[model samples]
Target chain A: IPGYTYGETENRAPFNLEDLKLLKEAVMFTAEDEEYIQKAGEVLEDQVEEILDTWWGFVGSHPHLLYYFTSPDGTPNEKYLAAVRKRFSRWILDTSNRSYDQAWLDYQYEIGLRHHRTKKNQTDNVESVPNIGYRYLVAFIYPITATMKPFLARKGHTPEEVEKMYQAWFKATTLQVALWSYPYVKYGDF
Target chain B: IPGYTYGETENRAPFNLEDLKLLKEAVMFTAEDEEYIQKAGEVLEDQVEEILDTWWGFVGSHPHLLYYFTSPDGTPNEKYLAAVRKRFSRWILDTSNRSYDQAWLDYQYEIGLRHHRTKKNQTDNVESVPNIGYRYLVAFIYPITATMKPFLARKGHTPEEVEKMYQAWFKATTLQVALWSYPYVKYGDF
Candidate 1:
């Protein structure tokens, strides 16, 4: 037994039981949706680094958001930037791969929780407080999804396929962002 | 497979592979220690409510700490208080139960994360926000363990046995609190 506090186990479910069903109903995420996503993912897998680089370029210019990624001395933190970019790239693929399993859901929760600030401490290796507020996650969906449209088109897909993929990504990314926002919501009611 | 973002998962061990071992070595948590703790837990099983009541009474008076337990209207939140008390009671028992597996360890991380303030809005269901800071966790350990001594002694144990039980409890509680402080620490370094 996992001892205490809700009888929680090492392999606990991270999201509500109704959540997967809720998302599927909202997005009408289907086999065709998954196929379209996978196709787009395969086509764009090689561009992961480039995609992240471009996204980071935008983030780097932002005053508040850049604080989370940079060192206290104001020089951009290459290590922190590189580390986050790796996950950001995987996020691009995972958003489309469309499994939407419990693991997918849990990681989204972790992503959301990780971005927020914890209590003050000296041990934090990074110079600045790593508090990525809730609004930033919401603010990011537009630039992230909209920027991908041109990339999808460049992967030799027709305009129709590109729009379809973009729509699929738009819905999927929004849903994940919503899931990520759970901790930010009071009592996780949302 | 769990998606990566520092490779977190529901079943993932909460700390480095070396953490449990490191803790054991540091605390000298042995089979004998386990036996002593289990004995004390069995003796204290009947006093869970009393134990929690006393603990809560102490917490209720604390200016900063009580805010997490009380409702916005300034009255006590019975449901939220009771829910947390049940967990708090279990923690008292589980510390001595000595079944420190991965599940036990991971829950400590969850406990740590749950105590911090996240971004605010509808999602979190508990009436007021519930962010227990790390310093409080550290502070509470002394009183909790100290309070338990009389209870353990009342269970008809000898002075030596009472001391052994107390020492075992001290190590166990400290270890668990250390685990719970992971999220409070910067990037979980603590």
Candidate 2:
């Protein structure tokens, strides 16, 4: 079975069960965590705009991070930022829902591939047209998941509740990034 | 960079140029291989239906393999089979094209994922609800690719020419299968 390649047909299937099982175990996700996350979503819903602004502001300020956000002409691309932000904002709620279905998993793989590199002669006219490195995608997890703690705290929950929410976010983020790293590590030398 | 997980916005982007470069090198794909494949394809065009019929018959007759072709009610699914056959037939031609664009690569990822396993309560009703496993995907390469050679030879190609075509197909099939194994081998041992 080793070293053999198969032909590509359209894939119309779901993620592997074992991989999902391993992911669940690695993340230590639970039914209770799902509930806690939904509660976090309830309390944090109104603050999504503010939170995203903070996140985007931080990213836009960093020279390396900002590279991908700018237009090919070198100025910041408001069109790209605004478009991405709309979807980025929804991610908070999606995370809170904990609906990690096959589509969600597939999206993670797509995101990983997207971050790994962009193709030539395509329509995404943002800077870093070729794409950012996988390490950058991995590096982003910390700032993203850690930044959420303070926001969750701002919702005025008790220390224990905030910790639970933070933990859930932490695990979920880890699980996702790991999935995203697939293409980078698939062959060798990740 | 170890534990970061980014958000999944819509990927609306193409495959990375660098990855395709690496893949081409890894597979040792060449322009000559491409030419041989196209020639073989042109010669084999008329025999596609017969070729596919033999391929389908082989898969359908195997006890373990046939499971995936049947409906939950234990009846053979002609609709699914027909749909799959249409795509399966294209794969023979696509291998010859050697375009390997973003869509093609993404479809490989999808195919890999599809062969892995289905999640509970998902709508993909094809047999082997849980994926067929990575080893099986690899194992399939030999019979599937090897079977094509005889049909290819029958097209009046000289033995040497047929060997070149076979060699081209071998490389192409192996390259594709490796791509298809992504979802299966991403996290841990298969």
lDDT of each: 0.60, 0.60
Measured on C-alpha atoms, candidate 1 has an lDDT of 0.60
| TM-scores vs. true structure, each candidate | 0.46, 0.45
Clashing pairs in 2: A5-B173, A5-B174, A5-B177, A6-B177, A118-A130, A141-B4, A141-B5, B68-B127, B116-B131, B117-B131
For candidate 2, write residues B1-190 as lDDT tens digits.
1111112212322335565554444444567787888988887788999998887777776545666666777777776667667756777776676476665666565555555552211323445244553434444544555578787788787888997787677667666665665554434321
Which portions of model 2 show Cα errors greater than 4 Å? A1-15, A118-128, A188-190, B1-190
Top candidate, metric DockQ: 2
RMSD of 1: 23.4
Residue lDDT tens for model 1, A74-140? 7677766665666566677767674776666566665666665542112234555546544345445
